[PDB]
Amino acid sequence: AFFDLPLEELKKYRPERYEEKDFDEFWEETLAESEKFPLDPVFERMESHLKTVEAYDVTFSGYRGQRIKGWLLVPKLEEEKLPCVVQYIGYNGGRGFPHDWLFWPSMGYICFVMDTRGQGSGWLKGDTPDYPEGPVDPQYPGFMTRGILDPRTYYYRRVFTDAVRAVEAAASFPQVDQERIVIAGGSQGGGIALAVSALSKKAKALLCDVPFLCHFRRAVQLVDTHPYAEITNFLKTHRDKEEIVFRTLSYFDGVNFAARAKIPALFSVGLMDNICPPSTVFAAYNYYAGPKEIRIYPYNNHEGGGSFQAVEQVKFLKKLFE
Amino acid sequence: AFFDLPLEELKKYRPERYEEKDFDEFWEETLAESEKFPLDPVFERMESHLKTVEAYDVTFSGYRGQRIKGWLLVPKLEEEKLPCVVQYIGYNGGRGFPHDWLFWPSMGYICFVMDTRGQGSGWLKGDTPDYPEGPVDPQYPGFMTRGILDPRTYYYRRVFTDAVRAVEAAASFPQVDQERIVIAGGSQGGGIALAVSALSKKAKALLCDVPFLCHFRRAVQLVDTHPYAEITNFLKTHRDKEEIVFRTLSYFDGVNFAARAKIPALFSVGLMDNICPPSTVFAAYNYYAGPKEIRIYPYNNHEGGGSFQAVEQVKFLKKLFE
Amino acid sequence: AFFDLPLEELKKYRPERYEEKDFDEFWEETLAESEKFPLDPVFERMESHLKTVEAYDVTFSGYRGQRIKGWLLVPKLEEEKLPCVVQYIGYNGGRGFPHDWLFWPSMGYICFVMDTRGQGSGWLKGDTPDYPEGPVDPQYPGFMTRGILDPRTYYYRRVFTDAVRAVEAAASFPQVDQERIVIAGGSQGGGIALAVSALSKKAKALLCDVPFLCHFRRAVQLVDTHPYAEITNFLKTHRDKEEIVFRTLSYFDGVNFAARAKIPALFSVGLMDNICPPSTVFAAYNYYAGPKEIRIYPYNNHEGGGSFQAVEQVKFLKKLFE
Amino acid sequence: AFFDLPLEELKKYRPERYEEKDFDEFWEETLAESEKFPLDPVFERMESHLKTVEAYDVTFSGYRGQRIKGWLLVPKLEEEKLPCVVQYIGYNGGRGFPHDWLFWPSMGYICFVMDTRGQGSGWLKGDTPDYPEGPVDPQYPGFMTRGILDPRTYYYRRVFTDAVRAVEAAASFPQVDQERIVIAGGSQGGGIALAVSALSKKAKALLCDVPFLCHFRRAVQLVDTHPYAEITNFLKTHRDKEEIVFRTLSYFDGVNFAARAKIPALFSVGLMDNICPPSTVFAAYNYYAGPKEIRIYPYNNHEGGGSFQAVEQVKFLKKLFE
Amino acid sequence: AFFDLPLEELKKYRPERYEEKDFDEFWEETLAESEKFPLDPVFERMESHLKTVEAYDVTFSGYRGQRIKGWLLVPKLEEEKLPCVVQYIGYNGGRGFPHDWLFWPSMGYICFVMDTRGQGSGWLKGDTPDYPEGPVDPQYPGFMTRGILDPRTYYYRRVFTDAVRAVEAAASFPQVDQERIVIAGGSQGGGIALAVSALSKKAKALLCDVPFLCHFRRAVQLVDTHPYAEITNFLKTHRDKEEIVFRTLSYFDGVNFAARAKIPALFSVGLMDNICPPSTVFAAYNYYAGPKEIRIYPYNNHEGGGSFQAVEQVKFLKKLFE
Amino acid sequence: AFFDLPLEELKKYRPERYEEKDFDEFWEETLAESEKFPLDPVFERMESHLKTVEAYDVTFSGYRGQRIKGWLLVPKLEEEKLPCVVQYIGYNGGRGFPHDWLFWPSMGYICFVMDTRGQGSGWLKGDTPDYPEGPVDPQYPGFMTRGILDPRTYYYRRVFTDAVRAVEAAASFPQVDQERIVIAGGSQGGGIALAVSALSKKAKALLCDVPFLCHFRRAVQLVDTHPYAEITNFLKTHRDKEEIVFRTLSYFDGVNFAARAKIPALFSVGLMDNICPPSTVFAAYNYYAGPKEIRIYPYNNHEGGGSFQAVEQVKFLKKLFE
């Protein structure tokens, strides 16, 4: 019984955008403030059972100098400068083990896996704490409503800033070819990557699968699945805070970043996805301002194109970087 | 379709207790450190539509001087010194509105309603933030696993301390009869009250309904409901952290507090409660070291005795304070 | 999933009304027949633990002299004549205990709580039996299909008559200010109150929250929740009886009463309510012929505005009666 | 998902019986009172599309002369006196159409199908009303709690009396061999048959499949399915009425009837049945005082043996009657 | 919360049909190839407990001379040549016991019950195997995707051919009136019957209830129920095979057969049916090229009209055959 | 709210084994019959985007010469002879793409991935057909009851033979170190691997995670999840076939193979696993006749140890092979 707009409508779907007059200023100032702290990227080579890949334990300074973990996986190859995928992680995930991230290396790409602050407890473990802007306001369980009463205190202000800085950290690794740095993610990872496509000066291509954190007002109207339902549940209780909540969310909405993003991108969507509804994904894709393609999977839910989509991504990047 | 131990077994159920050798020292030090900050209780009389009750907006210093909101409701009665109920709130709730707490005042008791730090977003709104001990470690969405890797950082260290200090703040109000201060709650509120029944020197009676935060190791093995499932889900991912997690929780387990509590108590239990299973409630009741009674509701789930139990509580206190 | 018409369409939703030519005559004759039995209101003061409120055990004659229970709660105040709220109860509920109805008394209103015939066994206990018009026809479990093959035998004929008579009983209490009698309820209580707003000559204001018993034909096509599903399930079996069922229901449909009601009203609606869908609520609101306001809660289900709405009601009445 | 006692324990399961001292007196007086009214059986031959069977529209006097509907289906055969099955119907069922009951006629048996007072609205239509003992007390939706506060007013007193009288009515039809009258049913129908097996002097054999209305106290503890859950839901609300409820139910419990029943019986049971749990079925079977067999279906739920069981019944009766 | 197009749209719903240019050639060749094998119908009279009906154990040659089981039930009547219903069976069913099919015989019709190859394990037993066209390709569990990458290997090619030949077998029985041979089924049985109404030269009337195997592309878009979901799940995995899957299904789509069928038909449809959605049933009914009626059940799910529809079918055939 | 035996009982759980006298003879003959067809292993190097791994498209002869697909992935390393993992696949999966199997190659092992006959349509695509032993008997949807009425026709006879032959095919590849061939799988893959540990003379160690196809009689009594429920559903219908079904299954039960298996093994088990209940896994582990260890994950469901367990396997094999 799930259904969004028909495909012909989805392809033309361009809802009115809402953002505050200071959207750009907010992000400029946020990034400037964090850039005042040295990146201090650390890549510690590890003793590992992996044989085809060199694994490094990563640390770097993200939001306000806060130290973020990651992995760096380098495939053992003759080529001196290698292309690079900066990988962002889905909701309730974390960096896990180096072996959880063998795809891109196996395809000949260095992979920088960014750990997600405060999460890492749902489906894959993580090692990086969050650090709040002082008091942690009343919230619904999870990360979606953490600090939501003000953009400056909002959880994803910190995540997005870490994500922008992760690309700088990857770029600092000597074996990375800076002309071929890719930002990638699915769901939460895709919404992060979308922000980064607008904010980073270093990223050269975007892989954005079944993106989360897009078109919040519609998402919350359409589905009662988690994690978007964290927001709805907040609003069910804090009935006086509707305007404020959506004002805050406007600064983090992937649709508003997409409108600013200029790098080439490959999107994916599942037309039966009731976690990240197709209309939210198409809103972002349709506003995306760089060269772009989308793979559409009519019969898939939130798994999207799965391993088929991974192949499409390899082919897409090969072609782009020739 | 849910079933725990048979009632005859429940009434004898006395599982081996597990606590660390420094349980008492941990709490002594915690309370002493927070007592270095002045209580600074504030009772601001409000403009209210309420006619039978005077409503006050409360502020007091809880954990490490952190400012905690509440309500004080005083029934308009001839009697100069009135008995007092300190009310703690269930999971995902908050102090809401003064009119949400009209029972005890209508029964002739001053009511001090403690707002719950960081919550107030699920079923009733709240106004009080949490403040973490530095970094907010990776966690499962919610409050159950917030800081769980160390008792000093654990969420309920802060809440329990707030709750002890709430009794002090209530006692400071001039119309409160200090010989008749009651601590009360259901589920999370009951878990909090149980802690307070061991840690407070001011409380004179305990009302403990369908208590949560009891017998964690058993809870997690019996039910897959929330909020106990937050802990299970954390353990599913952080497979290396089992011993630490349960070590931490031993400092907050209502069964360990029950063993230390000396004041008279009225407990309630629902034999079909699959949020707070009867074996966890009985383990706390059975170890409870003060004079005690329990009302048993054989066909009820987590709603327990509802309004029938409210009557029992009114009768229990009337007799006790005679 | 759940979504009704968009808000802008809800606000203009005025479906074609269906009623029989004898609607008014049916109700005139029903009321006249019951008025031939004396009201014989009895208010027995009770021994109570309540301190701020005087409680009375109520009996009064409703449908065809049948004796209906209730509570009268009188707040202890200086004022001689007090305003009064006649409170109707949700489905499967009953008058419970006096202490279940402290809100309005606390706000300075006498509260007359009407027990619901034959129900009182789902979420709050009741003490009043139903009396059928002779044989109790085949029915689906519950009260929705009880006597549904004829308006004269239909369950809500008896309830609505009781409810009209409850206002008269409340008005007969000496401390009640007859210029300030309010009729109030949510869901079933809201549907009852809406009928009473049309049929009573004594009621001065209506509070109608998330009303049930409105726009039955649409309700049954939109949702499969209880209690509306009792009707669907009856029609699934009695496939020959569709026209008769909807003809019967037409006499009891809150939309048809709304069109006749002239007193001032405050409605509420939850846009995600799948027990009483927004389109059924708006159909009644939009046809409501008295001076009217509605509070709209976009993210709420059947809980509606909860405690926020209770505040809106106190403010609405104060302004209305000043 | 569901499991009752192991089969080896079920075979030995003989729980302590509870009944009042006046069990037999209550039923003697009940039957005597209803026998003061003339049976007045009516068998109206119908215009029917059926070719192999003669269909009759039946009326007879059941509880206190109340007129109960039925079907009589007579297979067109040479034999002058035919054996007869009196068929009782499952919960929320009714007599439906004559073609709904072609099994037994096809097997050469006259079939008397008894309509069920007040039901007939869930899965098959019915035509027979209920007639309460005056006021219809507060109840949970359905038939299980109708009049449950007193055995004199309890719904199944009426149904069981109709059912005893149905056998009388069948026996009055001239083509019926009175030496070969069988009483049959499944679930509610089985619970009714079991009562009739103890109370009727005309029945010659019992078919009792997956019987309902057995061992209530256990049923309610074991499963949360309907219809047993109507009782649990009533007890969750009316918390003061537990002793009275089970006192009443004791007069209608199939286990108490089984202990008095002397005619030959074939039972069936599904070991995965969570509507009528095996332990309640076995408690009845085990106390059953006549010659008895049971067919055990280890992998079946409430469907039991289905068409396999029907064959077992035909074989069992053939052997019994030859 | 299930709904298809509104009824007034359903009645006009005529979606664009898709079929390959060799649809007729495919079926002509398929039938001709199976007709090269002798029908070799066997009717073995059985020892049976049935008294009003003669039962025969049936064997006949279906797809490529493969031996299919069945039952023949002949009502014991004076008339020499009787009318005949060829009955096809629902998904996961089989021919069961002769006593499972007493309706039509009781109504004066010989009944030929066709067993379903490879099924017979879900709700009623079966005795007939399937015989694949060589290798059994990767498939989702069930019969819907068995051989779906090629019409020649597809499961329903074999079933439909069995079904055409079952009419021939029935016609070969000497007591069968060949002017009054009816083909009938519900759900899968209805989809089979609809194919046979196009492909058989012997059938004289169609009873088609809540037909399955219709308008596959829409079905899969609308509902996530089984068995249509078998297809969706296959497509979720085999993301490269969408075009081939629906090309294959086009040769077996009840809508494409309906457009070729010329015999008189009675359809039924449940407007809340979420197994066989109304729009798929109406697409088939609307394209049906013979004389036709539809019974519409607005409140029923996949049960459709149940026993009310059976009565309509008897009346329909009586009128047509006079 | 699921639970199997307590861990201390699980560790001692050794249920009575049931097998037929000809268990060994059945497998000797099965293997000898298939060995009469040449293995004819084909390894075709592929054009691939993979850089750290060489991919081969595999074909080999399994059951009765039937041609099975696979992948061989060889990591690019200096070492001449490499250790090898033969990987079997979970239920409804297939060989998918080479990039789906990067773990073991990345750890320095050649990986031979066996495609699963007739599956490949649920979560990962497959390319290998099944070939039945003639007719495909009536079955419940899926593979668990395919040919279950006879061990000779049973689906897993074919799968387990394929799997024994897959090890021979891997051993035939020149770079494979035959002293370091590992057999591996989870769930269905684990059940297959367990059979192979008993039947293959070439395997050197077993990795067996959360094994399926174990202790069938118990599994079916404990859980109603798929795929074990396919058997239960079959038995619900074919009520006369219980003894036959379990006799057939005894030949394929992982507990019976475990008793014969002599190679070193690492098992894993999730104590909350309700697909493969812990009692079935422990019954196999406890009868396992080779040197053995088990990793126990107390809080995990069917995911077991996930990436943690992968690490344990790499460490286990390194230690074993020194």
PDB file of N, CA and C in Angstrom, chain B residues 88 113 132 149 209 223 258 321:
ATOM      1  N   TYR B  88       7.679  12.270  40.353  1.00  0.00           N
ATOM      2  CA  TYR B  88       8.575  12.036  39.238  1.00  0.00           C
ATOM      3  C   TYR B  88       7.804  11.473  38.043  1.00  0.00           C
ATOM      4  N   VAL B 113       6.151  18.789  41.215  1.00  0.00           N
ATOM      5  CA  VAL B 113       6.330  18.007  39.977  1.00  0.00           C
ATOM      6  C   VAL B 113       7.698  18.314  39.407  1.00  0.00           C
ATOM      7  N   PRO B 132      25.684  16.993  29.570  1.00  0.00           N
ATOM      8  CA  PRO B 132      26.600  15.851  29.702  1.00  0.00           C
ATOM      9  C   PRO B 132      27.931  16.154  30.419  1.00  0.00           C
ATOM     10  N   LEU B 149      28.882   3.720  29.328  1.00  0.00           N
ATOM     11  CA  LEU B 149      30.171   3.103  29.480  1.00  0.00           C
ATOM     12  C   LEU B 149      30.919   3.469  30.785  1.00  0.00           C
ATOM     13  N   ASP B 209       4.984   2.651  41.603  1.00  0.00           N
ATOM     14  CA  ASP B 209       4.125   1.921  40.673  1.00  0.00           C
ATOM     15  C   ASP B 209       4.872   1.371  39.496  1.00  0.00           C
ATOM     16  N   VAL B 223      11.986  -9.125  27.798  1.00  0.00           N
ATOM     17  CA  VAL B 223      11.131  -8.342  26.915  1.00  0.00           C
ATOM     18  C   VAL B 223      11.925  -7.635  25.858  1.00  0.00           C
ATOM     19  N   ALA B 258      16.559  -0.618  46.686  1.00  0.00           N
ATOM     20  CA  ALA B 258      15.477  -1.190  47.520  1.00  0.00           C
ATOM     21  C   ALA B 258      16.081  -1.821  48.798  1.00  0.00           C
ATOM     22  N   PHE B 321       0.008   8.245  57.967  1.00  0.00           N
ATOM     23  CA  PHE B 321       0.255   9.507  58.674  1.00  0.00           C
ATOM     24  C   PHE B 321      -0.706   9.735  59.855  1.00  0.00           C
TER      25      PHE B 321
END
